[PDB]
Design a protein around this ligand. Structure first.
Ligand code: CHL
Ligand code: CLA
Ligand code: CLA
Ligand code: CLA
Ligand code: CLA
Ligand code: CLA
Ligand code: CLA
Ligand SMILES: CCCCCCCCCCCCCCCC(=O)OC[C@H](CO[C@@H]1O[C@H](CS(=O)(=O)O)[C@@H](O)[C@H](O)[C@H]1O)OC(=O)CCCCCCCCCCCCCCC
Ligand SMILES: CC1=C[C@H](O)CC(C)(C)[C@H]1/C=C/C(C)=C/C=C/C(C)=C/C=C/C=C(C)/C=C/C=C(C)/C=C/C1=C(C)C[C@H](O)CC1(C)C
Ligand SMILES: CC1=C[C@H](O)CC(C)(C)[C@H]1/C=C/C(C)=C/C=C/C(C)=C/C=C/C=C(C)/C=C/C=C(C)/C=C/C1=C(C)C[C@H](O)CC1(C)C
Ligand SMILES: CC1=C(/C=C/C(C)=C/C=C/C(C)=C/C=C\C=C(C)\C=C\C=C(C)\C=C\C2=C(C)CCCC2(C)C)C(C)(C)CCC1
Lengths: 154, 498, 297, 144, 93, 215
């Protein structure tokens, strides 16, 4: 981690090979180990609802990108089962890769995509930066906020 | 007719040279373009392996010969066989996955991805080079990218590690160049550097021994051989984990590939002279690194010394003059390229959350981070030569190659078989202890570490996609061996009476 | 008659889908997998019940018959080497499979209520079913390589199950201690297997026994190497059955949960050494001093 | 002595005239295969077992897996060649001519099967392997 | 056919079923090809996915940049910045 | 919040056997598998409704056991692990005893337990089999759904994984399917003159023929 204040140095030595957990006499058995901490509940959600929630939480591709990402692997498996020529499979895989990457390039940029200096500026200024970067052309952005990327200026 | 191998070598570096035409900021467009190039190149190698590589052919395939310099009789010559296609596919797979795992890099993303594509091109050019000076050039072509990656995206001691790495590799590679000059100038009429015509060359015993030493010093600097291994612990420990994939999965196997292609194939008599002394060195390397690993408090240094220990089985399979030993060496090359890269990746991703180095202060990580615990345990089991994984079958085939070997008689065959056995007693002793000092026990963690702290979909996919071939080869080893059973036999065909 | 044996590959590989699906889900879809807790346990119980019914029919057939059925396949085809994998159904295998299935189904039923309030329920049952798969593969193994494969897999499952509560430091030490103590025996067993292959040239039990008897009776091999290989083979049985001097892992193996204590260290895993010695008993009979060593140990 | 100094020994010629008449050796022999020394009884047991192993090769014969047929044929052929040499060399003098004739016929069948595999001809491979099969059954019947 | 029965005096007879089977090289190439396409599909899909930790404020807010040495450099930077802040405060006063 | 061990009646807008129709007033969704199907009004009397529910449960369980014991041995015979199985001819086989004395012994043994069940239905709690341990409290079971140590050694009822109503409708639905299946098997064994799985095999192939209309 990071300390804003110089930490107290370790006066007493510690065994290298010892386990780094708490002492066995300080261990709250049944709670620290999850052995008696699961009490059931009538309020259990649907299995397929949980599947859908977990899939949607990953932020899947949507639309044509979602369609091709869903239909790529079954199409490849069917083409290999039906003994269709493999050159068509390679053409389809390359087209899928290029289309997916181009679509992902077309997607708007987020604050986490930039340098830590850009991430850790004023939040309003950062919001204006992100709003402009996804709106105007890259040349106008570079001629307007270019000097913000000279990290030695400040 | 089409230059497949030339296109495969040229495409990544040529595409990465155009990464500086992008005026975009951030890393999104750069990383997506780089992964597009990597996946297109991977599909290209897949097409080449599927449609133009024949595993039953012991000869060179897809050869391309373009004269570049007349004075050295030096040709851009490319060609693949059963020995090279495995490392080529492993290089493509590991480099694409290392590009995918290097996505949080926001500082100098353009240069990072350009260096990744340059490393792609250089490794592929080495693994498919049929000219000695071209082999040397592709060998040298990675000193600068790895140096920059270490010095700009490494750890705390990255600069000293990078300096030590580049100086050690240059010190080995000057002996490599001296060996290249000696072999390529032995021709009575004109100099020649093609490996095909050099495989039939006859040398005196002393000159062959000198050339073997000149090549072996370089191949012992690169592939870690005691005591030329000291660059590896600080180089791999203080490197980026994405770069650690290439360092411990691809670049380490290049020394072994050079040992098979040059020391084992071009100079068989000197190799037969040197191999019994290589067996003892490999066994002592296994024992020495498996004993150095418990002494390392740093996690990445322990993994690096584990890699040094695992290279000893490759050395044994090289030195044991059998087809089975060479097949086990190739299988261990593939297994270690699948295991060490994933272990380094998991170590780096875990450090990105825990932000601790020494093992005696990282208890209880299994409570906020269970999935990375599961992947770390599974890849440790793969490191442990556990059956169902590629490591066990690789070590077993190496053992069989020693037992079936005709060069050694009885007692050394015992004292080496016992030897590596001690290694597979020492290999648990630190590894599980590592896990016991990295995941077991209870620590009170922050509430913010309860969510958005474990490995995401990308890291889970990377670990799963490297773990699946391990199981697939541990169940059916002939998914790999059948690519190189023929060519290895040809390599062995020069070691018997003729 | 010969139909039942043909379809006996299903015996080790029938529990396997439950650990496969539990691992894949718990690594990818954790909440959805954990929504089916007792369903997973009953699926494991039903699969083990099917395996137990097959094993009972096999045992009944084996009692009133004078035939042993072996099935083999070529695992590896190389120019210099060739490996085989298959299953052998002799009365020892039937006895062990009955013992394993009968104890393990009751252990699964018990574990349904033992881990009623635990959160590692699915991981627990996946570990148990994978151990059942490994042990059933071990008892039906036909060659020494397969024996060693499922030997080490069973040891791995024991290591995972002993240190089940990884937050407990005593179990944290105990699992590693058990794995290292069993790995000493694995080292001995592998050395013995390699020595037996060098002496004989085969991994099949019957051919190796006949070759070793022919070699010993005609004095075509030195006795010291045979005794050394026998002692190395017996070292693995000593370690896995927790005998002197490798008995230290067994008391620490009880830091795991009690159904693991029962199934692993009471009926099945500790019986692997007895199974291996009984399997290699025709080999140990002709070897001079190894029976006295076994009795003394 | 700890290790051999020169090149590894090659195919040792058989002393029972079971090789080819023109060459003195068989084409399917592979150098570098470890043969365990058991004796005449062990060689007979391995001969019968490996004849059964080669009669287990019906499934491997196909348009896509002829290379594995050739590999298994070379491996087992070297093994049974040297086992046949060992058992003929220790056979009684009255039983040596029939054993040598049987070995010669079996190895001619091996050569014909390898030749059929080389041309990638599947019906020829099947017919040559059927002749090899009846010869191998004769071998196990003799050596039971 | 591929079945051998051995009888041993004083022992139970054994019936051995054998089948020399191996995957064709075409099947192995199919396995390699499908794994390459699966790797490409997964790279695309799980690169398009969101990263829970590396896009979070817990990582980027502390100064993380995907670089392995940002923690030590950030620590030395904040000590140097504290000393420079003391120097600034003494200059102003 | 915890585990509810009481059956929850279905809402009045539950799916019905004949959608768009009015469910009968005596079928309020409190019974397992309640779909409002009573054209003849046989369940108008609540006492006869309880008796008919218990009879349906008994027929369901016996039919599921029956169809399992027909199909699984038949599936084993087709696989080849049963030499001469035939469920139609199973009653006329040779056993260690005559069918008549076996029937009398079965009558006595089964009329013990069927009669203990009768006493439980008439007087709930009059016969208790679950042990009365010193401080364990035995929950009161529903009539027709008993089970502590013996009949419910899994504790899958009483609100565990799926609520009691859900599992009871699952049981009743599988039971109805099994009753229909067993009656179909009984008619097929005398109509087609063949086995069940054989009839399924000749129906799956060319289903336009090999039907009820071609014997
Ligand atoms: C309770 C339900 C029950 C049912 C539905 C059947 C059904 C059938 N039995 Mg079975 N049996 C039943 C109970 C019993 N049977 C038998 C003993 C027999 C005999 C001895 C025979 C049958 C036969 C038959 C068939 C009559 C035509 C028919 C498949 C006959 C047959 O051969 O067809 C399969 C036959 O001869 N059953 C006994 C012992 C007395 C039973 C005791 O519960
Ligand atoms: C419960 C489901 C059920 C199922 C899946 C089958 C299945 C089969 N029957 Mg059987 N059968 C049943 C009940 C069932 N039967 C009943 C209740 C009776 C009479 C009381 C019969 C009497 C019977 C005869 C007389 C014959 C078959 C035959 C066959 C085949 C169909 C072709 C046909 O002509 O028969 C249709 C026959 C009927 C009398 C229709 C009964 C349908 C009932 C009332 C309802 C089932 C519907 C419901 C949606 C089931 C779900 C389907 C699926 C999800 C399980 C098929 C293998 C034929 C055969 O195999 O010839 C080669 C044939 O000859 N069956
Ligand atoms: C127990 C016997 C039973 C019976 C006799 C019926 C009878 C009927 N159902 Mg009902 N149904 C039942 C149980 C039953 N259902 C159950 C358990 C459910 C689940 C809640 C339903 C839900 C249901 C739905 C969703 C539908 C029907 C439909 C139908 C009608 C169409 C059948 C037909 O004409 O084709 C003859 C079929 C042959 C194979 C010959 C029919 C009057 C349909 C409806 O009522 O309108 C048409 C329809 O859409 N039923
Ligand atoms: C074994 C006998 C049996 C019995 C006693 C019951 C009893 C009951 N049923 Mg169930 N049921 C059965 C079998 C049976 N069912 C079968 C086979 C099916 C699928 C077709 C269903 C489907 C079903 C539905 C969809 C519903 C019920 C419901 C009801 C309840 C109210 C209706 C009534 O008063 O029943 C009194 C019943 C009897 C006394 C039986 C009389 C039958 C006559 C005398 C002759 C039998 C007819 C004939 C021989 C059929 C041959 C088979 C056919 C394919 C040719 C009651 C608990 C309702 C409910 O609320 O659930 C609780 C409801 O909605 N049942
Ligand atoms: C619903 C009740 C039920 C009933 C009444 C029967 C009745 C019968 N079974 Mg079936 N059976 C059932 C369910 C049932 N089975 C189930 C759930 C299974 C498991 C799949 C089987 C599997 C089965 C087998 C494997 C065999 C029978 C056979 C028999 C017959 C005599 C054996 C026996 O009962 O004494 C045995 C009593 C013991 C307690 C021991 C008899 C017709 C036998 C047969 O077909 O006769 C030739 C036989 O071989 N049954
Ligand atoms: C077909 C499905 C079925 C279903 C869903 C139910 C559902 C219900 N029953 Mg009923 N029951 C059935 C068939 C079924 N029953 C049969 C055939 C009988 C006659 C024996 C009974 C008689 C009965 C009794 C006497 C009791 C119940 C009870 C219950 C509850 C327990 C949950 C359950 O059974 O597990 C759902 C899952 C299954 C049924 C899976 C099928 C089982 C497979 C085929 C075999 C079991 C595997 C293995 C061989 C067993 C372990 C081996 C061990 C003995 C060594 C639930 C409300 C209990 C009750 O209501 O108390 C509240 C009660 O004690 N049932
Ligand atoms: C056409 C669509 C359809 C749909 C959506 C459903 C829906 C459902 N069925 Mg039904 N079912 C259907 C047709 C259908 N069924 C048919 C054709 C049959 C054969 C007659 C059945 C027989 C059936 C059985 C035997 C069971 C279900 C069960 C279930 C429920 C459990 C879901 C699982 O998971 C679910 C509400 C389960 C249930 O709730 O009953 C206990 C169950 O065990 N269904
Ligand atoms: C080589 C084998 C290496 C095995 C490493 C296991 C590491 C571990 O315990 O991780 C435990 C953590 C957390 O468990 C999850 O989180 C909880 C952990 S606990 O119960 O609180 O300890 C709990 O809910 C439950 O275990 C699960 O949901 O695992 C995961 O996050 C995913 C595990 C997926 C696989 C589980 C089944 C494995 C069966 C055997 C497979 C073959 C072997
Ligand atoms: C109409 C109406 C009207 C109103 O309104 C309403 C309602 C009532 C609801 C409706 C309906 C009705 C119905 C349809 C009914 C049906 C029923 C059934 C089907 C039953 C069966 C049922 C069935 C059952 C129990 C069954 C049983 C069986 C058994 C035991 C068996 C036995 C056996 C076996 C196994 C085998 C062997 O080898 C032989 C034997 C020995 C022989
Ligand atoms: C007819 C025909 C004709 C043609 O030919 C062909 C075809 C088509 C195939 C056919 C059809 C068929 C059908 C459909 C059938 C169905 C069935 C069923 C439903 C069954 C169940 C069945 C079912 C069953 C057995 C079940 C059972 C159960 C049980 C025992 C239980 C137990 C238990 C309990 C209680 C409780 C606890 O806690 C637990 C336990 C212990 C676990
Ligand atoms: C050499 C090579 C390669 C190949 C490979 C292969 C050929 C593979 C295969 C594979 C296979 C053919 C496989 C199969 C199967 C598998 C399976 C069946 C699995 C399962 C699993 C599960 C279910 C789970 C798991 C897990 C995870 C993921 C982690 C954690 C732990 C656990 C264990 C839970 C490549 C292309 C990469 C490239 C480079 C070179």
């Amino acid at each position: 981690g990071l300390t804003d204040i110089e930490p107290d140095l370790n006066e007493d030595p510690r065994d290298r090979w010892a386990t780094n957990g708490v002492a066995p006499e300080d261990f709250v058995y049944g709670k620290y180990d999850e052995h008696h901490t699961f009490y059931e509940s009538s309020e259990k959600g649907s299995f397929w609802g949980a599947v859908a929630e977990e899939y949607n939480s990953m932020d899947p591709p949507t639309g044509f990108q979602g369609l091709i990402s869903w239909l790529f692997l079954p199409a490849v498996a069917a083409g290999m089962y039906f003994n269709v020529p493999g050159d068509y499979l390679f053409i389809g895989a390359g087209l899928f890769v290029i289309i997916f990457c181009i679509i992902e390039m077309d997607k708007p940029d987020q604050p986490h995509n930039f340098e830590p200096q850009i991430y850790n500026m004023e939040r309003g200024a950062r919001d204006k930066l992100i709003a402009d970067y996804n709106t105007m052309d890259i040349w106008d952005f570079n001629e307007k906020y270019g000097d913000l990327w000279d990290f030695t200026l400040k | 007719s089409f230059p497949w191998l030339t296109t495969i070598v040229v495409l990544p570096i040529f595409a990465g040279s155009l990464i500086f035409l992008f005026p975009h900021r951030g890393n999104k467009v750069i990383r997506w373009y780089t992964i597009c190039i990597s996946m297109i190149e991977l599909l290209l190698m897949t097409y080449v392996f599927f449609y133009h590589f024949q595993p039953d052919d012991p000869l060179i395939q897809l050869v391309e010969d373009y004269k570049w310099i007349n004075f050295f009789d030096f040709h851009w010559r490319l060609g693949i066989d059963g020995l090279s296609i495995g490392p080529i596919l492993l290089t493509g797979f590991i480099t694409t996955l290392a590009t995918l795992a290097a996505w949080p890099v926001t500082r100098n993303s353009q240069l990072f991805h350009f260096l990744m594509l340059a490393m792609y091109s250089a490794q592929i050019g080495l693994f498919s080079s049929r000219d000695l000076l071209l082999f040397f050039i592709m060998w040298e072509l990675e000193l600068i990218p790895v140096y920059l990656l270490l010095s700009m995206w490494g750890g705390k001691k990255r600069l000293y590690s990078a300096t030590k790495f580049i100086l050690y590799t240059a010190g080995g590679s000057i002996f490599l160049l001296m060996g290249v000059l000696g072999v390529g100038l032995y021709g009575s009429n004109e100099p020649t550097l093609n490996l095909e015509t050099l495989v039939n060359q006859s040398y005196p015993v002393a000159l062959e021994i000198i050339f073997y030493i000149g090549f072996f010093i370089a191949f012992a600097v690169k592939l870690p051989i005691i005591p030329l291994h000291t660059w590896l612990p600080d180089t791999h420990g203080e490197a980026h984990y994405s770069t650690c994939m290439l360092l411990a999965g691809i670049l380490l196997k290049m020394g072994a590939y050079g040992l098979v292609r040059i020391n084992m194939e071009l100079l068989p008599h000197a190799h037969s002279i040197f191999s019994p002394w290589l067996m003892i060195i490999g066994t002592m390397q296994i024992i020495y690194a498996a004993s150095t690993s418990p002494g390392q408090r740093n996690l990445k240094k322990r993994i690096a010394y584990s890699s040094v220990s695992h290279m000893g089985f490759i050395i044994i399979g090289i030195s044991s003059i059998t087809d089975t030993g060479l097949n086990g060496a190739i299988l261990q090359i593939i297994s270690h390229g699948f295991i060490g890269a994933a272990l380094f990746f998991l170590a780096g991703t875990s450090y990105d959350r825990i932000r601790l180095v020494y093992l005696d202060e990282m208890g209880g990580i299994a409570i906020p981070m269970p999935k990375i615990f599961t992947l770390f345990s599974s890849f440790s089991m793969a490191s442990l030569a556990l059956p169902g994984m590629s490591g066990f079958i690789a070590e077993l085939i190496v053992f069989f190659g020693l037992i079936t070997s005709q060069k050694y008689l009885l007692i050394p065959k015992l004292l080496i078989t016992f030897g590596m056995a001690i290694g597979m007693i020492l290999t648990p002793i630190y590894l599980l202890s590592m896990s016991r000092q990295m995941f077991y026990g209870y620590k009170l963690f922050n509430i913010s570490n309860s969510s958005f702290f474990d490995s995401g979909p990308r890291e889970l996919f990377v670990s799963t996609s490297i773990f699946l071939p391990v199981i697939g080869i541990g169940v059916y080893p002939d998914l790999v061996l059948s690519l190189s059973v023929e060519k290895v036999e040809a390599i062995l065909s020069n070691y018997f009476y003729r | 008659m010969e139909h039942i044996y043909q379809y006996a590959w299903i015996i080790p590989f029938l529990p396997l889908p439950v650990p496969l699906l539990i691992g894949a889900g718990l690594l990818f879809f954790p909440t959805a997998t954990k929504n089916l807790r007792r369903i997973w346990a009953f699926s494991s119980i039903s699969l083990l019940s099917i395996v137990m019914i097959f094993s009972m029919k096999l045992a009944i057939q084996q009692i009133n018959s004078n035939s042993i059925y072996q099935y083999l396949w070529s695992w590896t085809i190389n120019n210099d080497f060739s490996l085989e994998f298959g299953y052998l159904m002799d009365p020892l295998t039937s006895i062990m499979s009955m013992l394993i299935t009968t104890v393990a189904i009751l252990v699964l039923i018990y574990s349904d209520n033992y881990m009623s309030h635990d959160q590692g329920y699915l991981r627990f049952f996946a570990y148990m079913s994978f151990f059942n798969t490994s042990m059933l593969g071990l008892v039906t193994s036909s060659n020494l390589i397969q024996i060693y494969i499922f030997w080490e897999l069973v040891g791995m499952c024991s290591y995972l199950l002993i240190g089940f509560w990884f937050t407990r430091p005593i179990a944290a030490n105990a699992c590693q201690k058990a794995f290292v103590t069993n790995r000493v025996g694995d080292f001995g067993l592998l050395l013995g297997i390699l020595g037996l292959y060098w002496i004989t040239g085969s991994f099949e039990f019957r051919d190796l026994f006949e070759i070793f008897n022919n070699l010993i009776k005609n004095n075509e091999v030195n006795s010291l190497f045979c005794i050394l290989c026998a002692f190395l083979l017996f070292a693995g049985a000593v370690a896995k059955s927790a005998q002197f001097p490798l008995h230290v892992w067994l008391p620490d193996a009880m830091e795991g949960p009690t159904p693991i204590s029962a199934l692993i260290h009471a009926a099945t895993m500790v019986a692997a050494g007895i199974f291996l010695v009984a399997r290699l008993l025709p080999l140990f009979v002709v070897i001079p001093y190894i029976m006295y060593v076994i009795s003394f140990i | 002595q700890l290790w051999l100094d020169g090149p590894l020994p090659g195919l040792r010629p058989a002393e029972n005239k079971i090789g080819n008449e023109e060459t003195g050796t068989r084409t399917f022999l592979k150098k570098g295969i470890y043969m365990a020394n058991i004796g005449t009884k062990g060689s007979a047991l391995r001969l019968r077992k490996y004849a059964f192993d080669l009669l287990a090769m019906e499934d491997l014969i196909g348009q896509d897996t002829l290379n594995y047929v050739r590999r298994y044929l070379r491996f087992k052929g070297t093994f049974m060649y040297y086992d046949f040499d060992k058992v003929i060399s220790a056979a009684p003098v009255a039983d040596k001519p029939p054993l040598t004739n049987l070995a010669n016929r079996l190895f001619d069948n091996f050569e014909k099967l390898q030749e059929a595999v080389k041309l990638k001809d599947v019906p020829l491979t099947r017919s040559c392997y059927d002749d090899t099969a009846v010869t191998l059954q004769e071998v196990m019947n003799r050596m039971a | 056919m591929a079945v051998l029965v051995e009888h041993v005096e004083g022992q139970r007879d054994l019936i051995t079923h054998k089948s020399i089977w191996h995957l064709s090289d075409a099947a192995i190439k199919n396995v390699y090809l499908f794994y390459m396409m699966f790797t490409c599909w997964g790279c695309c899909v799980f690169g398009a996915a969101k990263d829970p930790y590396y896009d979070s404020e817990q990582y980027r807010g502390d100064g993380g940049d995907g670089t392995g040495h940002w923690v030590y450099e950030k620590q030395e930077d904040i000590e140097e910045a504290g000393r420079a802040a003391l120097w600034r405060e003494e200059l102003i006063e | 919040g915890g585990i509810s061990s009481v059956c929850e009646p279905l809402p009045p807008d539950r799916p019905l056997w004949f959608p768009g129709s009015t469910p009968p007033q005596w079928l309020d969704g409190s019974l397992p598998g309640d779909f409002g199907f009573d054209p003849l009004g046989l369940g108008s009397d609540p006492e006869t409704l309880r008796w008919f529910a218990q009879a349906e449960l008994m027929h369901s369980r016996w039919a599921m056991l029956a169809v399992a014991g027909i199909l699984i041995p038949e599936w084993l015979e087709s696989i080849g692990l049963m030499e001469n199985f035939n469920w139609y001819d199973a009653g006329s086989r040779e056993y260690f005893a005559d069918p008549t004395t076996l029937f009398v012994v079965q009558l006595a043994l089964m009329g013990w337990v069927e009669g203990r069940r009768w006493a439980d239905y008439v007087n709930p709690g009059c016969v208790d089999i679950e042990p009365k341990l010193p401080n364990r409290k035995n929950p009161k079971p529903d009539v027709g759904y008993p089970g502590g140590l013996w009949f419910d050694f899994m504790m899958w009822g009483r609100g565990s994984p799926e609520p009691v109503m859900v599992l009871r409708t699952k049981e009743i639905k599988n039971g109805r399917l099994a009753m229909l299946a067993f009656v179909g098997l009984c008619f097929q064994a005398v109509y087609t003159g063949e086995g069940p799985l054989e009839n399924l095999s000749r129906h799956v192939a060319d289903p336009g023929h090999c039907n009820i209309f071609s014997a």
